[PDB]
Design a protein around this nucleic acid. Sequence first.
DNA 1: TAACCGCCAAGGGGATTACTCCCTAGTCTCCAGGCACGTGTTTTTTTTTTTTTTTTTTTTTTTTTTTTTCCTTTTTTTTTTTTTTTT
Length: 48
Amino acid sequence: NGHTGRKINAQVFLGPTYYQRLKHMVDDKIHSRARGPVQILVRQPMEG
DNA sequence: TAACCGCCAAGGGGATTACTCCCTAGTCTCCAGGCACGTGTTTTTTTTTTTTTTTTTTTTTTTTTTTTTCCTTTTTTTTTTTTTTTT
């Protein structure tokens, strides 16, 4: 255990694998909006 | 070789005369099928509404989110200014 130091009762499977990162970061996907631009036709919020 | 003619012989039935009889010509008189007139009830034609399939039209196709790229005219005709040549 990390917090207490006790042995884990169930033995665990460990070893090196090969992992790949993906381009879907949260910095490129977070979005928030309170009030902003409106359309010139329907006065609705933007896209994207 | 038997048609035809001449001669002879025989017989069969149509013509003739008379008697009869019976069936039809003629004339009333009653009445009934034959026929003139009217029309029908099936037959064909025409509408009428439906039926049944084919064809055409129209509308539809789960939602949300994030990046680029290209384009957002173009040739073709008409006009208008400019430049060069000539008298």
